[PDB]
Amino acid sequence: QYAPQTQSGRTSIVHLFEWRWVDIALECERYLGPKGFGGVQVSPPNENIVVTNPSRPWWERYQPVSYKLCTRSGNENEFRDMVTRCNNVGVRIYVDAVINHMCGSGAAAGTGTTCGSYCNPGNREFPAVPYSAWDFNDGKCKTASGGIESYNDPYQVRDCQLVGLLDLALEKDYVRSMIADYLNKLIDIGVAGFRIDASKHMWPGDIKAVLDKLHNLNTNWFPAGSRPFIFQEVIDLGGEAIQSSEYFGNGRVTEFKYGAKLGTVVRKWSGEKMSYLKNWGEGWGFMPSDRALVFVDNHDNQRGHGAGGASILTFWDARLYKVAVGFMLAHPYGFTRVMSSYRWARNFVNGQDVNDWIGPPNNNGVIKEVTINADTTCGNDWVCEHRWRQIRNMVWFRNVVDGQPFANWWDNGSNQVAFGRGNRGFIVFNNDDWQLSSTLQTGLPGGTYCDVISGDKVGNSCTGIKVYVSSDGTAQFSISNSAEDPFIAIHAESKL
Numbered sequence: 001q002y003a004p005q006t007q008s009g010r011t012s013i014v015h016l017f018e019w020r021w022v023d024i025a026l027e028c029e030r031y032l033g034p035k036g037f038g039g040v041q042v043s044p045p046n047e048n049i050v051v052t053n054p055s056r057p058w059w060e061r062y063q064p065v066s067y068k069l070c071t072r073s074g075n076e077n078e079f080r081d082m083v084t085r086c087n088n089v090g091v092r093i094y095v096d097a098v099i100n101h102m103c104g105s106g107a108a109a110g111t112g113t114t115c116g117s118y119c120n121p122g123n124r125e126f127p128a129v130p131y132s133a134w135d136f137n138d139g140k141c142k143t144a145s146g147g148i149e150s151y152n153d154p155y156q157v158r159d160c161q162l163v164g165l166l167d168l169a170l171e172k173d174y175v176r177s178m179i180a181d182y183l184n185k186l187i188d189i190g191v192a193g194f195r196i197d198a199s200k201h202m203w204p205g206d207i208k209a210v211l212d213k214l215h216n217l218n219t220n221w222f223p224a225g226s227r228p229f230i231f232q233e234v235i236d237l238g239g240e241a242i243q244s245s246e247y248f249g250n251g252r253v254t255e256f257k258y259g260a261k262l263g264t265v266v267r268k269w270s271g272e273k274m275s276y277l278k279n280w281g282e283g284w285g286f287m288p289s290d291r292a293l294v295f296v297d298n299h300d301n302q303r304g305h306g307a308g309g310a311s312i313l314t315f316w317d318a319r320l321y322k323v324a325v326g327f328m329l330a331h332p333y334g335f336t337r338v339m340s341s342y343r344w345a346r347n348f349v350n351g352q353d354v355n356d357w358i359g360p361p362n363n364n365g366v367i368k369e370v371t372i373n374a375d376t377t378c379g380n381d382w383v384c385e386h387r388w389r390q391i392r393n394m395v396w397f398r399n400v401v402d403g404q405p406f407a408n409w410w411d412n413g414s415n416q417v418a419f420g421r422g423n424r425g426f427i428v429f430n431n432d433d434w435q436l437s438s439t440l441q442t443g444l445p446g447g448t449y450c451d452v453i454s455g456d457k458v459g460n461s462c463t464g465i466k467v468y469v470s471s472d473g474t475a476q477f478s479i480s481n482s483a484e485d486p487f488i489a490i491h492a493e494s495k496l
């Protein structure tokens, strides 16, 4: 449940948010496999309701109507093809499992659904599963509105409707079994694990009873007896009634404190500074490393009013975002997920983006293909952060240094910091408003190394900055505060 089941030596996954299955299959072969990525988190592959007010938002995909594999990302054949092809080049697929609820209680009855299934939300009828009224928690929720009125009461949080979504009676074996049958179909197809959506809104015990029904992973790609990787979405920034430790028995948990705090530090808000990161990880009150799934932003909080609020760093804030993603990927804490986004027209009204609903790039509702430019960037308003040099090389950095201890920390008492990973990697940051120019101990063997932030090692040369390390492990690092990327990283595989 805790082991990611990636190929040996691969240490991150990427959220290819709202990508079509055919484009993910191609990306696995032409890019993710060759560049050392461990796997992909995909958008929910099961049938959802069609929302027309507003027009096809991203979040319609968190409103299930059946477990048929039929969505705007593609159909069941295309999903299978993607899983097979990705696994065949060593890139695992992790599914976003939406299991707490079905669609909105206020939605109209009919067949406005991604595969044409019928449903009647008002009467709690979902004949394509099938579910009926007694498979929901309406009788169990004690609030007058039927919704969550206080997050201080763990019963309401779990038994009542999250933003009006019909809440499944997860205590019942019939419901646990219908969900297990869906997840087991995906496992047998070749999926490696699951994100469990909205885990805060289910009882840890109910989740566990579903997980105990799951198959071992498919032996065409995994060793016999392998269990699916499980990571649960629980938002707990501390001082809440529900704690992320309640879920540790089932698998890993999203550590949302990580991006919220790192965002604040890198922006230098609330008196925070990078020198405080010396004891990052458990030292900051975070969950144990072997239970954590970490990330700078996710698909919800990149829109600026989720967990972390305005502190969250995203691709819109590109320069600081790269700094935060770089720090994350170099630091040993947690298992890392990299975000991959699309661009939308932000429209702020009272510090609130009123266009935060906008769905992926589309022609009249049909998701646009991911086009690849000659310079390796993406077209059609797909951002492709995972293709940015600074991000892809730090993904490789994490592979190269896997297993090596945190070492050789240095700071200037303010916002210049450095550290290494054993004798295989070293990274240096300048987030201060003045020049960094210092000779630091790197822990690496003497030689000339390419900086993998400003360039690449190509043949026997570097395309960006070169760092000469003395026989005693020291090197000079010079970084201006006006550098495009105010950080440098070198590792064992970037040595000439």
Ligand SMILES: OC[C@H]1O[C@@H]2O[C@H]3[C@H](O)[C@@H](O)[C@@H](O[C@H]4[C@H](O)[C@@H](O)[C@@H](O[C@H]5[C@H](O)[C@@H](O)[C@@H](O[C@H]6[C@H](O)[C@@H](O)[C@@H](O[C@H]7[C@H](O)[C@@H](O)[C@@H](O[C@H]1[C@H](O)[C@H]2O)O[C@@H]7CO)O[C@@H]6CO)O[C@@H]5CO)O[C@@H]4CO)O[C@@H]3CO
Binding pocket: 052, 053, 054, 055, 104, 106, 107, 108
């Ligand atoms: O009246 C025009 C409208 O008619 C039809 O909408 C149906 C819809 O198909 C039904 O399912 C139902 O809608 C329910 C929702 O199911 C329920 O969730 C809730 O909706 C709230 C929304 O969730 C929330 O986003 C907000 O909606 C805003 C919306 O974001 C704006 O974009 C704007 O919506 C306009 C649409 O963009 C436009 O296409 C058209 O919509 C048609 C729709 O295509 C058709 O299927 O006009 C609307 C209105 O300008 O404004 C809305 C409203 O502020 O808030 C809503 C409401 O709380 O509740 C609704 C109502 O039951 O019923 C409608 C028919 O009323």
Ligand SMILES: OC[C@H]1O[C@@H]2O[C@H]3[C@H](O)[C@@H](O)[C@@H](O[C@H]4[C@H](O)[C@@H](O)[C@@H](O[C@H]5[C@H](O)[C@@H](O)[C@@H](O[C@H]6[C@H](O)[C@@H](O)[C@@H](O[C@H]7[C@H](O)[C@@H](O)[C@@H](O[C@H]1[C@H](O)[C@H]2O)O[C@@H]7CO)O[C@@H]6CO)O[C@@H]5CO)O[C@@H]4CO)O[C@@H]3CO
Binding pocket: 127, 130, 131, 132, 133, 134, 135, 174
């Ligand atoms: O496909 C959905 C569902 O649709 C229909 O259910 C209707 C039904 O037509 C109506 O008669 C009425 O329900 C009746 C029952 O007919 C009657 O038996 C009794 O309910 C009791 C049951 O005898 C008892 O077993 C229990 O039902 C369990 C059931 O054993 C579980 O399997 C699970 O039910 C699921 C079914 O397995 C599944 O096939 C389908 O059911 C059809 C059904 O065939 C069809 O007639 O879905 C349901 C869940 O979606 O859980 C239930 C709940 O425990 O419940 C009681 C024992 O106290 O009396 C009711 C009168 O309400 O209305 C339903 C619509 O809800």
Ligand SMILES: OC[C@H]1O[C@@H]2O[C@H]3[C@H](O)[C@@H](O)[C@@H](O[C@H]4[C@H](O)[C@@H](O)[C@@H](O[C@H]5[C@H](O)[C@@H](O)[C@@H](O[C@H]6[C@H](O)[C@@H](O)[C@@H](O[C@H]7[C@H](O)[C@@H](O)[C@@H](O[C@H]1[C@H](O)[C@H]2O)O[C@@H]7CO)O[C@@H]6CO)O[C@@H]5CO)O[C@@H]4CO)O[C@@H]3CO
Binding pocket: 059, 062, 104, 147, 148, 149, 161, 162, 163, 164, 165, 300, 305, 306
């Ligand atoms: O149609 C359903 C729903 O779909 C979409 O919800 C998205 C949303 O865009 C994401 O931001 C996220 O929602 C998070 C919240 O960020 C998080 O805070 C929490 O939700 C709590 C709210 O923070 C809190 O304010 C309160 O919500 C009230 C809410 O103020 C009321 O307006 C009412 O909700 C209605 C919405 O106004 C209406 O638009 C629609 O909901 C959409 C939503 O617009 C859309 O973005 O219908 C509901 C009808 O009730 O009531 C609730 C009180 O229940 O408390 C909630 C907790 O209930 O958690 C959510 C979940 O992640 O993700 C969802 C997609 O799931």
Ligand SMILES: [Ca+2]
Binding pocket: 100, 157, 158, 159, 160, 167, 168, 201, 202
């Ligand atoms: Ca629930």
Ligand SMILES: [Cl-]
Binding pocket: 233, 254, 298
């Ligand atoms: Cl998440």
